[PDB]
Design a binder for this molecule. Structure first.
Ligand SMILES: Nc1ncnc2c1ncn2[C@@H]1O[C@H](COP(=O)(O)OP(=O)(O)O)[C@@H](O)[C@H]1O
Ligand SMILES: Nc1ncnc2c1ncn2[C@@H]1O[C@H](COP(=O)(O)OP(=O)(O)O)[C@@H](O)[C@H]1O
Ligand SMILES: [Mg+2]
Ligand SMILES: [Mg+2]
Ligand SMILES: [Mg+2]
Ligand SMILES: [Mg+2]
Lengths: 211, 356, 356, 211
């Protein structure tokens, strides 16, 4: 049956290291227009540290790897995204726990629990112009894919492609949370940096699950 | 580009080392980075801690000393520090009487300082919190993250630092900070953007007849871009906004160490009014000439007199910055004789020093 | 353009008014303009006076107070004040024990302060002079006006201000100032020029990989335009120049109040040497971030250690400026235990404050 | 016989007020290249004050007017040029004293004594790149004109025209005195501001003496 292995999750996180390095300046520029120009650096610094610690733990259980990842990000990313992405991974790990692979259904639950964590820490609602504008649609994609008994790889391919449109959907919102909310209507016309990071993370998961 | 730096990765390492070298009274800790009074822990006193991104020097490390902070957590440039750094620093400075965290209101500072407060509680450390949200530019908290903590953080760290030194309890410290937070008012403008070391371009560009009005401290654009005409004009718009945006309602969370949980507290601010007495801080955001700050003060005193406000003390200088930003902020904090007594009390920090 | 000013003609009027308003301890006199301690004349002490163009704030008015200057004469922007202002100010501050004039070495300051010294003598006032020429950039006095007085003026005003307050005589004050002048060494660089209020263009332009090396305080180009590469590089070139240009011979004139005439005095300076102890001043020229000054200090301490010099005290901040210039200067003043004792003695001025 | 009247001297100083106002920015730019960009403002502020005090004293003796002028400049111009031009007028007034008009010969002596004052206060030698590089040639012109028994108006016409070439001659000098001497060889290629001021003053005297 269709599942996502522990080494695919390792591979995912490893690809995040690559993407956050490559798109560092792009994310920075997004956070320059409607922020303080640091997001890219924060994500790069965080996943860079994650990906360094990863080879020493590549053989532990999925819950272990995700929880350490969240804790690593927390100790390193800083700013608003550090506690938010840290919480995502920590809550995702307690959905998972000692798994060695994950069914679509468990992936959905994992992402559902992660996002619920970012929503209660940050209180963002749809249209606030945050990473939650990508998480929520992503979770609902996973839910739908699960109903339809899709394979894990095409489920993530569809979640990823939904993440893309959701990130883009932010351009148009006036920010109501985060630093961008201080700019008022000046935040309209600009893509949310954190939502872009979620998009990149989902794009790398689709890649990780292809085989 | 053009900064006095070496490799971008090493800027804070080099700058913090220079801080520790210059200051016998300060200890630079490593792995995790943070800074403390070389004589912390000080037994018998509430310990005062704060922190935030690098780039606002002297806030906060310039305020570590007797009468002020016991330690501070510098983060990365314009980046809130992480909970482990705040946790270790608070552990290091704990004087048996509790630890007070002063937190500027940014999503990141709030969340990281909150995670840290809970870790401390769970370690048996008595702890509570004061949130600073003095920046009146963001008029309305309804559909925003809330007002920013800017230069008034300095006035509150001094006053609360004086009470902590006087021997006041955690609770009396916290309540003092929260009261002052409720009647302190700030606003900033930029004539030119800062450039972060990793950037080679400024955070925003601006024509010679334009200003960023209602700026904070991390280099984001302000609440609007408007014409720049004169000192008097600029100071008049700022002051008039201190008054019209003076009314403010919002919810701030503080740690109840007895419950062991976050306590929402809905609180409202009044605009400053005829008959109030204030401390005025005219604050360089980084690259304004001291002479121009005196020109700003000249105008501010006139507007204060006209509005019925009596300035009892002032600070004029570079106290809460944004790297190399050309601009300044005005802060007016309402006071009484008891608060003035704490103002005049000794303080011995790199940036502030008098008495004793 | 883009300065926080109103009409160009009124900038100093507005800025000086703001100074007097902010500072209860300072009296602003009019017709002629000058500034004094509100409690001058102080009977029983040598009175210390200085002055120079506006545009170097806080020097000199930020240094008016107990332990430092008794008064100061601000001129026009970058313009030496006239002899009538210095004359009236010295008359106002005369404490029965003499008046000491501290004069930075510029053709204009020298000539105006000289005309004033003679007027004072001719009024029965006991008076003499100290000339400051710490800037090592202009290597050779043979075919130049002589080395400029820059940031070391602050260290000397403090130390001599301490002796005057301790109760030392005019002569012991003068001789102390002249000795310190002989072993104090400064150098400045600019990454960006200042703009005077009447100008709308900066005093010089510069590419992103260029610096003005060996700049003073009035915005003139330095002794050369050279590549800018890094903090370490910049600080290394400056420091190496402090040493190689340390040797200096020239003639400085001081008033002999007994003769009633100018006394040439040919005097030579030694370069700082292995085993000397110093006070280090890392001085913002106006628009450099405090954080970068700490980065400069980090490097300076290394170079000092390597050269055998022990930094005993330091100041890091904006003490002697050039309006909105992006740059900094380094000053190293050689000291002994007796000079350190004067450093640590109380000082109560707008810019400098400790003890007592 | 050919003489320069007291009212022509008043007229001279009045024309200086005009020239120092008109050429304020030009003198400023000259003092920007090799100085601190203040000379023009200094001369404008000084002669502006002179020319305001002048109508109240237009009927006193030449020595009186020149000495007050020098004292007014001193109390007002500041910087290096204040004491230098103040001394010029003060020493010129003691050559003159209670005159009501001046012969070529007395003009020469007046300018000779003025310049001797600026030379001993400042110590400039020919080629130092200062106002003295114009004064000295100007005095020697007046001397020669006196030998040749020229009229006062053409004497000043020739002194003025010599002042022009002398000011221009400074472009080429490396400064050895004043603020410009701090620039070393960077002072070469630039006209001395103070020498230009002397030139303007001489040009206005020729004008004042024409009738
Ligand atoms: N209250 C919130 N809830 C969810 N996400 C948030 C919230 N506030 C900010 N964010 C996310 O954080 C991103 C900015 O992160 P970053 O630049 O790293 O932190 P900071 O704003 O402190 O500099 C935003 O683009 C947004 O997606
Ligand atoms: N030692 C000196 N002797 C004669 N003239 C001098 C001397 N030093 C400077 N000058 C004149 O002063 C002019 C500069 O004057 P100004 O800009 O008003 O004063 P400052 O240099 O103090 O700003 C120079 O161009 C030069 O002609
Ligand atoms: Mg950011
Ligand atoms: Mg940030
Ligand atoms: Mg000048
Ligand atoms: Mg000049």
């Amino acid at each position: 049956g269709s599942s996502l292995s522990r080494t695919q999750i390792v591979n995912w996180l490893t690809r995040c290291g690559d993407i956050f390095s490559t798109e560092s300046e792009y994310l920075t520029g997004l956070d320059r227009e409607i922020g303080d120009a640091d997001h890219g650096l924060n994500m790069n610094r965080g996943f860079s540290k994650v990906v360094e610690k990863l080879p020493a733990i590549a053989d532990k259980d999925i819950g272990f790897i995700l929880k350490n990842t969240g804790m690593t990000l927390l100790s390193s990313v800083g700013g608003a995204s550090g506690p938010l992405f840290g919480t995502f991974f920590i809550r995702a790990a307690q959905a998972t726990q000692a798994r060695q692979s994950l069914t679509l259904e468990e992936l959905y639950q994992m992402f559902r629990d992660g996002a619920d964590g970012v929503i209660s820490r940050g209180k963002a609602e749809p249209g606030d112009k945050t990473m939650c504008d990508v998480w929520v649609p992503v979770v609902e994609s996973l839910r739908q894919s699960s109903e339809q008994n899709l394979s894990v790889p095409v489920a993530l391919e569809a979640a990823s492609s939904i993440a893309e449109s959701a990130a883009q959907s932010t351009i148009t919102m006036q920010a109501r949370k985060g630093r961008a909310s201080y700019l008022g209507e000046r935040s309209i016309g600009h893509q949310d940096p954190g939502a872009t990071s979620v998009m990149f993370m989902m794009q790398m998961l689709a890649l990780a699950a292809k085989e | 580009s053009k900064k006095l730096i070496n490799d971008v990765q090493d800027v804070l390492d080099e700058q913090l080392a220079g801080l520790a070298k210059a200051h016998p009274s300060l200890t630079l800790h490593q792995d995790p980075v943070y800074v403390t009074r070389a004589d912390a822990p000080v037994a018998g006193k509430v310990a005062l801690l704060s922190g935030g991104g690098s780039g606002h020097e002297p806030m906060h490390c310039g305020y570590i000393g007797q009468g002020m902070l016991s330690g501070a957590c510098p983060g990365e440039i314009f980046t809130s520090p992480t909970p482990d750094k705040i946790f270790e620093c608070a552990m290091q400075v704990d004087g048996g009487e509790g630890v007070l965290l002063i937190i500027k209101n940014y999503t990141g500072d709030i969340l990281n300082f909150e995670t840290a407060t809970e870790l401390l509680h769970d370690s048996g450390v008595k702890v509570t919190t004061v949130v600073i949200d003095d920046d009146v530019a963001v008029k309305d908290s309804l559909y925003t993250a809330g007002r920013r903590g800017v230069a008034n953080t300095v006035l509150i760290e001094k006053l609360v630092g004086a009470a902590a030194e006087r021997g006041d309890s955690l609770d009396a410290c916290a309540e003092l900070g929260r009261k002052l937070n409720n009647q302190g008012h700030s606003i900033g403008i930029a004539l030119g953007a800062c450039t972060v070391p990793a950037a080679g371009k400024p955070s925003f560009t601006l024509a010679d007849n334009e200003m960023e009005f209602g700026v904070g401290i991390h280099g984001e654009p302000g609440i609007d871009r408007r014409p720049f005409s004169s000192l008097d004009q600029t100071v008049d718009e700022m002051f008039d906004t201190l008054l019209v945006n003076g009314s403010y309602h919002r919810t701030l969370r503080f740690w109840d160490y007895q419950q062991g949980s976050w306590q929402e507290e809905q609180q409202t601010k009044q605009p400053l009014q005829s008959g109030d007495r204030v401390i005025a801080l005219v604050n360089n955001l980084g690259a304004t000439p001291l002479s121009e700050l005196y020109g700003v003060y000249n105008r501010l005193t006139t507007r204060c007199q006209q509005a019925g406000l009596t300035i009892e003390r002032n600070l004029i200088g570079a106290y809460c910055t944004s790297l190399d930003m050309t601009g300044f902020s005005i802060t007016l904090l309402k006071v009484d004789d008891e608060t003035l007594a704490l103002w005049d009390a000794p303080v011995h920090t790199p940036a502030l020093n008098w008495g004793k």
